[PDB]
Design an enzyme around this catalytic site. Sequence first.
Site, short mmCIF file in Angstrom:
data_model
loop_
_atom_site.label_atom_id
_atom_site.label_comp_id
_atom_site.label_asym_id
_atom_site.label_seq_id
_atom_site.Cartn_x
_atom_site.Cartn_y
_atom_site.Cartn_z
N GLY B 32 9.12 0.12 5.41
CA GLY B 32 10.05 0.48 6.47
C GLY B 32 9.43 0.99 7.75
O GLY B 32 10.05 0.92 8.84
N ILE B 33 8.21 1.52 7.66
CA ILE B 33 7.55 1.98 8.85
C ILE B 33 6.93 0.84 9.66
O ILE B 33 6.49 1.09 10.76
CB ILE B 33 6.46 3.10 8.61
CG1 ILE B 33 5.16 2.52 8.05
CG2 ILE B 33 7.04 4.24 7.80
CD1 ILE B 33 4.00 3.50 8.03
N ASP B 41 10.38 -5.89 5.59
CA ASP B 41 10.18 -5.12 4.36
C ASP B 41 10.41 -5.99 3.09
O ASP B 41 10.42 -7.24 3.16
CB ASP B 41 11.01 -3.83 4.42
CG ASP B 41 12.51 -4.04 4.27
OD1 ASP B 41 13.00 -5.06 3.72
OD2 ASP B 41 13.21 -3.09 4.63
N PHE B 42 10.53 -5.37 1.92
CA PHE B 42 10.73 -6.10 0.70
C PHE B 42 12.19 -6.23 0.31
O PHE B 42 12.63 -7.32 -0.08
CB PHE B 42 9.95 -5.48 -0.45
CG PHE B 42 8.50 -5.58 -0.24
CD1 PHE B 42 7.85 -4.64 0.55
CD2 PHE B 42 7.79 -6.67 -0.75
CE1 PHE B 42 6.49 -4.77 0.81
CE2 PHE B 42 6.44 -6.78 -0.50
CZ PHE B 42 5.80 -5.84 0.28
N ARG B 43 12.88 -5.11 0.31
CA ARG B 43 14.15 -5.01 -0.39
C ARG B 43 15.38 -4.94 0.53
O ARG B 43 16.49 -4.82 0.03
CB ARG B 43 14.15 -3.81 -1.34
CG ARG B 43 13.08 -3.93 -2.44
CD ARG B 43 13.17 -2.88 -3.53
NE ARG B 43 12.18 -3.19 -4.54
CZ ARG B 43 10.86 -3.05 -4.39
NH1 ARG B 43 10.34 -2.53 -3.31
NH2 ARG B 43 10.07 -3.44 -5.36
N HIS B 133 -1.37 0.56 -2.84
CA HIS B 133 -1.12 -0.76 -3.37
C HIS B 133 -2.15 -1.75 -2.92
O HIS B 133 -1.93 -2.98 -2.91
CB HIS B 133 0.29 -1.17 -2.98
CG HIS B 133 1.34 -0.37 -3.69
ND1 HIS B 133 2.69 -0.49 -3.41
CD2 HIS B 133 1.25 0.56 -4.67
CE1 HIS B 133 3.37 0.33 -4.19
NE2 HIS B 133 2.52 0.96 -4.97
N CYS B 141 -12.66 -11.29 -8.42
CA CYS B 141 -12.42 -12.17 -9.55
C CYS B 141 -11.54 -11.44 -10.57
O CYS B 141 -11.82 -10.27 -10.92
CB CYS B 141 -13.75 -12.56 -10.18
SG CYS B 141 -13.57 -13.47 -11.72
N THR B 208 10.51 4.00 2.91
CA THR B 208 10.39 3.51 1.55
C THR B 208 11.63 3.74 0.72
O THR B 208 12.34 4.75 0.88
CB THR B 208 9.15 4.07 0.82
OG1 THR B 208 9.05 3.50 -0.49
CG2 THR B 208 9.18 5.58 0.73
N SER B 209 11.91 2.79 -0.19
CA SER B 209 13.08 2.87 -1.05
C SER B 209 12.73 3.57 -2.35
O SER B 209 13.57 3.77 -3.17
CB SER B 209 13.63 1.46 -1.35
OG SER B 209 12.65 0.66 -2.02
N1 LIG Z 1 12.74 0.40 10.81
C1 LIG Z 1 13.11 1.22 9.80
N2 LIG Z 1 13.31 2.56 9.92
C2 LIG Z 1 13.68 3.32 8.89
N3 LIG Z 1 13.85 2.84 7.65
C3 LIG Z 1 13.63 1.50 7.43
C4 LIG Z 1 13.27 0.62 8.49
N4 LIG Z 1 13.10 -0.64 8.01
C5 LIG Z 1 13.39 -0.56 6.73
N5 LIG Z 1 13.71 0.70 6.37
C6 LIG Z 1 13.96 1.17 5.02
O1 LIG Z 1 12.62 1.14 4.43
C7 LIG Z 1 12.68 0.93 3.01
C8 LIG Z 1 11.87 -0.31 2.61
O2 LIG Z 1 11.86 -0.32 1.21
P1 LIG Z 1 11.22 -1.59 0.38
O3 LIG Z 1 11.44 -2.82 1.24
O4 LIG Z 1 11.69 -1.40 -1.04
O5 LIG Z 1 9.65 -1.38 0.73
P2 LIG Z 1 8.67 -0.32 -0.05
O6 LIG Z 1 7.40 -0.19 0.72
O7 LIG Z 1 9.42 0.90 -0.52
O8 LIG Z 1 8.26 -1.19 -1.35
C9 LIG Z 1 7.31 -0.61 -2.29
C10 LIG Z 1 6.56 -1.79 -2.93
O9 LIG Z 1 7.47 -2.75 -3.49
C11 LIG Z 1 6.89 -4.05 -3.35
O10 LIG Z 1 7.05 -4.71 -4.61
C12 LIG Z 1 5.46 -3.84 -2.90
O11 LIG Z 1 4.72 -3.54 -4.10
C13 LIG Z 1 5.70 -2.60 -2.06
O12 LIG Z 1 4.47 -1.90 -1.78
C14 LIG Z 1 14.16 0.77 2.70
O13 LIG Z 1 14.72 2.00 2.14
C15 LIG Z 1 14.76 0.35 4.04
O14 LIG Z 1 16.14 0.73 4.14
ZN LIG Z 2 -15.75 -14.16 -12.19
#
Ligand SMILES: Nc1ncnc2c1ncn2[C@@H]1O[C@H](COP(=O)(O)OP(=O)(O)OC[C@H]2O[C@H](O)[C@H](O)[C@@H]2O)[C@@H](O)[C@H]1O
Ligand SMILES: [Zn+2]
Lengths: 301, 301
Positions: B32-33, B41-43, B133, B141, B208-209
């Site tokens: 999210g940052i 983002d992912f979710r 991560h 490898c 982050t979520s």
């Molecule tokens: N501009 C913004 N400002 C504030 N909040 C935001 C913004 N954009 C998005 N959000 C919020 O930001 C959050 C984004 O959450 P997720 O997308 O789950 O990303 P993660 O880093 O937690 O995912 C963790 C791991 O999952 C993966 O499998 C990889 O392994 C990752 O490393 C949400 O709550 C959005 O509402």
């Molecule tokens: Zn090898």
Amino acid sequence: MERLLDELTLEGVARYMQSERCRRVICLVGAGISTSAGIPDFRSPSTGLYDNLEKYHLPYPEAIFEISYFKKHPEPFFALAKELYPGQFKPTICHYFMRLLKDKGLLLRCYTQNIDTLERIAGLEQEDLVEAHGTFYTSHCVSASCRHEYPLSWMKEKIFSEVTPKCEDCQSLVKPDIVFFGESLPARFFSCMQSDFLKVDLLLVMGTSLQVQPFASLISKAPLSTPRLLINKEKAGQSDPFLGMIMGLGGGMDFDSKKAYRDVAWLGECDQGCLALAELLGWKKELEDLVRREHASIDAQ
Amino acid sequence: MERLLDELTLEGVARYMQSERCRRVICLVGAGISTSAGIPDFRSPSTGLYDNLEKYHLPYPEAIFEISYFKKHPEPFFALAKELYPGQFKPTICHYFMRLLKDKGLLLRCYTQNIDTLERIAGLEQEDLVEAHGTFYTSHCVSASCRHEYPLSWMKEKIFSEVTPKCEDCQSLVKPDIVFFGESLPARFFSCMQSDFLKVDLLLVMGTSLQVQPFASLISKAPLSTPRLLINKEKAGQSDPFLGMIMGLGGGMDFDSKKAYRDVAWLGECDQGCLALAELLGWKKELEDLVRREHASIDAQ
Ligand SMILES: Nc1ncnc2c1ncn2[C@@H]1O[C@H](COP(=O)(O)OP(=O)(O)OC[C@H]2O[C@H](O)[C@H](O)[C@@H]2O)[C@@H](O)[C@H]1O
Ligand SMILES: [Zn+2]
Ligand SMILES: Nc1ncnc2c1ncn2[C@@H]1O[C@H](COP(=O)(O)OP(=O)(O)OC[C@H]2O[C@H](O)[C@H](O)[C@@H]2O)[C@@H](O)[C@H]1O
Ligand SMILES: NC(=O)c1cccnc1
Ligand code: NA
Ligand SMILES: [Zn+2]
């Protein structure tokens, strides 16, 4: 750190259980305690339920017990649900061992993840039990604004007639109060947990892979000194961390590290481990007699 | 359970940050940052990566970063990996807000789940950072008996020539050191976590979520009195428990209950949240100037 086990073995746990210091036991159980009765577990390779759902063409096995999938596609759950209802199975030695703890004034609570009702059938009472993942006994409409209750008969009448049960007030899906992924656990889980885990002297963890939250958190709620005995086919709850692990960090069992001080894994069938423990405690004959007796009463009625 | 904040608001946090007591701040950040920089983002519904993988024909979206899926089907990940190499984007206001924390001597550590490198581009150094991560910088490898290292350029050659990276010694797959589901996290994550959370005075959780373990456990590693500010579009880490929840029981945030004593949720854009905080600290102008100069310097190079 009070070191309560004089050694990390079944024998050490039994010696502890006979002492004055072991007053209150909490059992944490799952589906592995009912496989010897003829009910498959969930996650055992090949035999478990989640390896046996191919005919439903699910995106992944857990979908059949997931609330969001269920709202889109309720039919596969309800087809499977015909088989889920209880009464064709008798409790196991492991269930009767818990009965024995009740009758010896040692059972603070049995927390179960199972919905087969075998704990009750083995004679644990409502107050002794937390059916953490719910019950088939009642059903509820899935709308938060309605939540109309429906009893077993109405659900059964629908399950066995292959009529997807709809709520008569709002036409939303109605489901048995078994806890699906994404759903709230029963309020009783949280209120009993809060007080129980302040005062538990032993955790007996049986027949569970500890692969779902929040149940898997319960082991970390006991006091740090409370011994924890696992009776299970495989080590569960003890795992190197990895991305996607179920347990919270540092929240698992430590059977094998150089710092292990209170966790014991007895690996084998739950019935055999309960017989073994009962033997060590001087209860084996009492337990065999109870099983023999209660199985006979069941065949009568 | 000691209460340090005078009120549960951004203003209270600012005041606490001005107190003598606030010496060590840990930031916990996710994707999210970096969304305001142009990186999805992912979710997030519709825009997030997991809602945009249809063309890879995956069993479920997370499969593309799942180690066993990868070994069997590496092609989808390596196709996606063109978009994934860090470079084209500039750090955000939020990243620079953390730079300011570093330069004001307040930043104990930034723990990031991102692999975009924007923290380094904003001027955080290796020592200030735990890339929880992993990273693209190095590749290894996958075979555990071999573990040959390959540098970024070797992986890019392979990525962009669209040949699947093979180990030159043992022919196993070679993978960028980003952490897949099922893989262990970098050793640094654990060594830094063991010491960092003993004396942290403030947690700042941004973008982050909190839907992945073990990173999500980090918030519960802080002492119980350490306040925790979430700057995020939505509340994360606060739920009623439910089956399949990511947080262990009671391991989350409590913004809203009547026992709430230390957690604050500022909801909105991370950039805006950090500007609002900067303002209340008197750093607004310094932050803006830093952003502009740095954006200007990158444009120049
Ligand atoms: N501009 C913004 N400002 C504030 N909040 C935001 C913004 N954009 C998005 N959000 C919020 O930001 C959050 C984004 O959450 P997720 O997308 O789950 O990303 P993660 O880093 O937690 O995912 C963790 C791991 O999952 C993966 O499998 C990889 O392994 C990752 O490393 C949400 O709550 C959005 O509402
Ligand atoms: Zn090898
Ligand atoms: N006879 C036996 N003796 C000892 N251990 C056994 C036996 N049979 C199986 N096991 C072990 O018993 C364990 C069974 O693990 P799982 O099958 O995951 O069942 P749960 O109760 O933990 O599943 C929890 C929830 O997940 C579902 O989604 C529902 O929501 C459930 O309520 C394994 O370690 C087996 O090796
Ligand atoms: N023992 C059980 O509760 C059970 C329920 C459904 C599937 N497998 C086991
Ligand atoms: Na049972
Ligand atoms: Zn209704």
